[PDB]
Amino acid sequence: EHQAIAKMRTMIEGFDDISHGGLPIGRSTLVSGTSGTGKTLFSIQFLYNGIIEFDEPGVFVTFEETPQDIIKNARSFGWDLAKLVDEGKLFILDASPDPEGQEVVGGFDLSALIERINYAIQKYRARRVSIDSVTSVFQQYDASSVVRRELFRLVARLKQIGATTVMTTERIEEYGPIARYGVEEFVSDNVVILRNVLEGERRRRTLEILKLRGTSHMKGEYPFTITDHGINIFPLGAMRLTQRSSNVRVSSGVVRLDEMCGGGFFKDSIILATGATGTGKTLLVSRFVENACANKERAILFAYAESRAQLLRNAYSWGMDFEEMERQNLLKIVCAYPESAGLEDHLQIIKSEINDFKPARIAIDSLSALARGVSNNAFRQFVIGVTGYAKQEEITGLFTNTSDQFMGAHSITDSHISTITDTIILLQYVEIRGEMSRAINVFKMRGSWHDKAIREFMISDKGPDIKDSFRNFERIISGSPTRITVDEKSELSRIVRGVQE
Amino acid sequence: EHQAIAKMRTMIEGFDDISHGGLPIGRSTLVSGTSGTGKTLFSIQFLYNGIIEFDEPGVFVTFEETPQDIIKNARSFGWDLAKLVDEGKLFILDASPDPEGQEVVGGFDLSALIERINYAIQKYRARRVSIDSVTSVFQQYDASSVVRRELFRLVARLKQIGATTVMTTERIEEYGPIARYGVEEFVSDNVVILRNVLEGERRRRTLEILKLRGTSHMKGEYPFTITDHGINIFPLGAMRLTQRSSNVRVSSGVVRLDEMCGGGFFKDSIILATGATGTGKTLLVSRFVENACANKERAILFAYAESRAQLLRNAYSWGMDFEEMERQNLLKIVCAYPESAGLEDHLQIIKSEINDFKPARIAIDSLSALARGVSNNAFRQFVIGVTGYAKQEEITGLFTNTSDQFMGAHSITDSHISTITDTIILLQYVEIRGEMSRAINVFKMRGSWHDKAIREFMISDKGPDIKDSFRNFERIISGSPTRITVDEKSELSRIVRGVQ
Ligand SMILES: Nc1ncnc2c1ncn2[C@@H]1O[C@H](COP(=O)(O)OP(=O)(O)OP(=O)(O)O)[C@@H](O)[C@H]1O
Ligand SMILES: Nc1ncnc2c1ncn2[C@@H]1O[C@H](COP(=O)(O)OP(=O)(O)OP(=O)(O)O)[C@@H](O)[C@H]1O
Ligand SMILES: Nc1ncnc2c1ncn2[C@@H]1O[C@H](COP(=O)(O)OP(=O)(O)OP(=O)(O)O)[C@@H](O)[C@H]1O
Ligand SMILES: Nc1ncnc2c1ncn2[C@@H]1O[C@H](COP(=O)(O)OP(=O)(O)OP(=O)(O)O)[C@@H](O)[C@H]1O
Ligand SMILES: [Mg+2]
Ligand SMILES: [Mg+2]
Ligand SMILES: [Mg+2]
Numbered sequence A: 001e002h003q004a005i006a007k008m009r010t011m012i013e014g015f016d017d018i019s020h021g022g023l024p025i026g027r028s029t030l031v032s033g034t035s036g037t038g039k040t041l042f043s044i045q046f047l048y049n050g051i052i053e054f055d056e057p058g059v060f061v062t063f064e065e066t067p068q069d070i071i072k073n074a075r076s077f078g079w080d081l082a083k084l085v086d087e088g089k090l091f092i093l094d095a096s097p098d099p100e101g102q103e104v105v106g107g108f109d110l111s112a113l114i115e116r117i118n119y120a121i122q123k124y125r126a127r128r129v130s131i132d133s134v135t136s137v138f139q140q141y142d143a144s145s146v147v148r149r150e151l152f153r154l155v156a157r158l159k160q161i162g163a164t165t166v167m168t169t170e171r172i173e174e175y176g177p178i179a180r181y182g183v184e185e186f187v188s189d190n191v192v193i194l195r196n197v198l199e200g201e202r203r204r205r206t207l208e209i210l211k212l213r214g215t216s217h218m219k220g221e222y223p224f225t226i227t228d229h230g231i232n233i234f235p236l237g238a239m240r241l242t243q244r245s246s247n248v249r250v251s252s253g254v255v256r257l258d259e260m261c262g263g264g265f266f267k268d269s270i271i272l273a274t275g276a277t278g279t280g281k282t283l284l285v286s287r288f289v290e291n292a293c294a295n296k297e298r299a300i301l302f303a304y305a306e307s308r309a310q311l312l313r314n315a316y317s318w319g320m321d322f323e324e325m326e327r328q329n330l331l332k333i334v335c336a337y338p339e340s341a342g343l344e345d346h347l348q349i350i351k352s353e354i355n356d357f358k359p360a361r362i363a364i365d366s367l368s369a370l371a372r373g374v375s376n377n378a379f380r381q382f383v384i385g386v387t388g389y390a391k392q393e394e395i396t397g398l399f400t401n402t403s404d405q406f407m408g409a410h411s412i413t414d415s416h417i418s419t420i421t422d423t424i425i426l427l428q429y430v431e432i433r434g435e436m437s438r439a440i441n442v443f444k445m446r447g448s449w450h451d452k453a454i455r456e457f458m459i460s461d462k463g464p465d466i467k468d469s470f471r472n473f474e475r476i477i478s479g480s481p482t483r484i485t486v487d488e489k490s491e492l493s494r495i496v497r498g499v500q501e
Numbered sequence B: 001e002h003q004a005i006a007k008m009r010t011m012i013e014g015f016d017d018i019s020h021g022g023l024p025i026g027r028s029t030l031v032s033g034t035s036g037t038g039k040t041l042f043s044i045q046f047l048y049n050g051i052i053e054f055d056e057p058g059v060f061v062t063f064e065e066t067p068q069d070i071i072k073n074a075r076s077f078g079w080d081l082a083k084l085v086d087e088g089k090l091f092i093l094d095a096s097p098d099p100e101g102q103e104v105v106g107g108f109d110l111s112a113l114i115e116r117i118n119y120a121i122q123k124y125r126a127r128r129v130s131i132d133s134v135t136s137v138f139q140q141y142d143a144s145s146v147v148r149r150e151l152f153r154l155v156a157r158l159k160q161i162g163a164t165t166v167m168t169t170e171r172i173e174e175y176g177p178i179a180r181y182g183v184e185e186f187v188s189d190n191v192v193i194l195r196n197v198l199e200g201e202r203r204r205r206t207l208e209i210l211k212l213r214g215t216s217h218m219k220g221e222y223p224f225t226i227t228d229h230g231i232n233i234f235p236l237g238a239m240r241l242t243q244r245s246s247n248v249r250v251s252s253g254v255v256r257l258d259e260m261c262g263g264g265f266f267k268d269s270i271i272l273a274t275g276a277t278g279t280g281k282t283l284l285v286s287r288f289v290e291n292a293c294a295n296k297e298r299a300i301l302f303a304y305a306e307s308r309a310q311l312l313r314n315a316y317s318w319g320m321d322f323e324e325m326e327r328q329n330l331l332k333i334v335c336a337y338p339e340s341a342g343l344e345d346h347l348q349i350i351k352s353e354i355n356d357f358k359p360a361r362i363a364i365d366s367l368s369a370l371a372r373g374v375s376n377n378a379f380r381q382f383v384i385g386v387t388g389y390a391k392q393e394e395i396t397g398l399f400t401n402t403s404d405q406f407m408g409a410h411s412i413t414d415s416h417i418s419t420i421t422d423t424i425i426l427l428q429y430v431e432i433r434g435e436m437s438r439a440i441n442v443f444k445m446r447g448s449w450h451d452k453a454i455r456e457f458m459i460s461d462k463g464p465d466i467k468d469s470f471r472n473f474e475r476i477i478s479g480s481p482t483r484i485t486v487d488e489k490s491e492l493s494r495i496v497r498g499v500q
């Protein structure tokens, strides 16, 4: 064919993007990785999606696990492969060693295997093939050079059958040799790397497509997650910056804050609320979610510092109630420690809830808690992920960032997120006459006017009460101001033009 | 020969400069690299160029990939190698093992292959040869020393025919040994090393010519990009300081700013708009991109933070419509996440997007949104790439850098780019009477006078409005100034009022 390589859609969430179409049809694809990375799953989900979506028959070849365990373990994702075997759509070819014993099973055992596969293909008329762990076979007497020739024989014979094949290899070091015998990478037309990279004490699942002979593909490690729906990769780079926008205004919950912003927040905009600890970020978040519920809209709250009851207690002390909003089903709370997962996991925990409850407002309280030790690079990618998702879903997102230094915030966000967010709200402490006092301040708005005043504000049983500025103070930002006005008034005066010592 | 070493051009974009003419005539060149680097592509593109550009026939010796597979692979880049093998200009030598099961195939398999290769040379009068993956033949039972002889016999034989050859070798570690058996490097007269360096979940593709026995070459790594057009190398050293300069002026979109610059921006100059987030920038950028269309010039806005629609939402809220000038084919937005590629790729996208549309003005919103995750050096040389290209191709370019710390920042650019640009526009925050007012300063203009005052300005539905400076103040640059009393200054009168 004069056409370039065509790809077959794996229908695995994300992989079709990173691979730019799927898998090169007619060729084999090497899915290599350390233990427990999701190799076996990738091969099964590939075959499974082949039957469900495109009615393409499949053949699975196992060398270690028993077909019973394959069907058993695949029930974790809700895949009745057994039925797919019954319907003649799926065929599991058992090639795992019988527990007894037989000498020399690497000679004509492979050449017979290839013809076993060919029969399995011809009989079931299968388009997709998965061969889990081709490593176990060569783990008998063979070494290096033996593997390369024998592996090439299987890749070659498979290609002539026209099978879109997916093979599997094991590893020892995360960033060491791509495959065991340091040879499989060069024989295979396609190479895919599954990593369970440590870093700290958490684990980050990454997928990389090393090479696709004949086509294009996204380069680098893209994070993924194994869930009850299977492999889920987030192409945080294929995300097209075409997110819609609107001049429709929504309320922050605080009336004056709507006026300080030139008619309330925008619907299609991300809101950041910085400031030291204790200023009142959680409160602005509370009042924010309160608005959507009152307008018969759905809204979610993600807390990463407070308990579920301490989030209701302090809220009830502000008069507002989340109970009734939960009772009438318009408000949803999550609450989870940042250490309970990695950033790759949390992103999906959010994203999943967004599809189920389908809110109109998102309030992630404390992004600063998701930078706890996590690299500044792995963080930005996550932030952009949430922001870049809530934007294309048209959801007003209010975020929160506790500044690590009270009184003297030389920079807005210490993790340099300030560029991504549209609307910025700055809260700060102002030492007035030996007293700490709040000072709400709208700092940026990308479509509206916006007030430019550094207004003080009190909080009580009602909370956010916005008063007047500090027109008689220098160096407000510093936190330790200075009274001016060297003039007086009222009645007077005389003249007596003289000194007068 | 009594003369110097003649080099045959490879026509690989960028490689000829690095190799100072191309590959040495009648000699071998080792192109080593790990999986997915670009070895096979380099060798194919080497032969394919000689046929189309120089009418120099080529023989491609394969060891693993079947011929008919290699044919379909080159079709990725729109290359009909099936046509070239049919025209007797290219020949794919199939030395791949049979898909059956023989072992007594080679008792003289080296001298046998050489006679085959040498037969194909004189048969097609080939001047260029590419031996793809010579490693995949020693993977029978050979050791390290055994390779040194079987290579040296093949290398010497091809040198006796007088053919310029490219031998491909594979490897595991990126910076460890150069070839598999740690032998191939010294056998070949020429050593090219391809890499796919990772460094933090990304992949930078770099070429390096380790050695060229005989002549000189550019020393070190150089970033390259495998695209639809094949290999594209950026030789940032081959770009010498020879870009024309002019004195013709252009407008920033803000007429008042043009006065502050003493007549407006220079045409062949790089302008930078540094300022904390929320100052101007995108407003300044927008106004700058508008001036082209009214002057009927083409402009390109590379956005790296906001969507294509949000820009329109903000532009239409400052007057200026982007729709019309896009319909007029005078304006082009781009929009792409910084993590949607590599610095090497963004440079090529920009370079290509310039050629296709041919703009007179360029606006790259937020360079600071490109240093995200990247090292300083990889970023610094990227800036020199886009800056130098806008200079040599003679284009006015406005850039943007968001300083991390608002009010108190004592460095213009955090990544220290200052010395590269020709004009630095500075925006900042000034706390006046418990409020957040803006200010615009023209920090430098390399060839003009420019106003040296820190004027404040407003942002409205009609745009910016540069006003009066902060004369009755001090410590402006620190964000939180001083009211200077003031002063006094006591409403005139004879003796005042009291003292008392
Ligand atoms: N419902 C699920 N939720 C979360 N994780 C799951 C679920 N089902 C399976 N997994 C994960 O899958 C992993 C096992 O990977 P899989 O069986 O896909 O191939 P593998 O174990 O990497 O390859 P091999 O079987 O050759 O070692 C387990 O570590 C487990 O954490
Ligand atoms: N009923 C109330 N009356 C007066 N002030 C209150 C009341 N409830 C809370 N506050 C004030 O709110 C401040 C805490 O702010 P908020 O409850 O919004 O969480 P937060 O400051 O964002 O929490 P953290 O900084 O720990 O993340 C406290 O310093 C307290 O003075
Ligand atoms: N149209 C295309 N656009 C972008 N990239 C492409 C395109 N076609 C091929 N590539 C890239 O070329 C790479 C393949 O490299 P190449 O074909 O040079 O062989 P190699 O991997 O260097 O050799 P070996 O497979 O023997 O290790 C793939 O990783 C792919 O990313
Ligand atoms: N319609 C408007 N009326 C008044 N002021 C506006 C209007 N639109 C925007 N602004 C002002 O412009 C500022 C934002 O600047 P702009 O959107 O031009 O780019 P920027 O904020 O420098 O970009 P970045 O967010 O990347 O720093 C806001 O602080 C706001 O004060
Ligand atoms: Mg397995
Ligand atoms: Mg809080
Ligand atoms: Mg190769």
Ligand SMILES: [Mg+2]
Binding pocket: B281, B282, B305, B365, B366
């Ligand atoms: Mg901007």
